[PDB]
């Protein structure tokens, strides 16, 4: 959800990629 691209795929470098 963060994460524009991607909300399904939530790993740590998911959140990095906002912050």
């Known amino acids: 959800d963060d994460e ?3 909300t399904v795929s939530k ?3 998911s959140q990095v ?3």
């Open 4 to 6: 524009a691209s991607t």
């Open 11 to 13: 790993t740590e470098t």
């Open 17 to 19: 990629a906002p912050a």
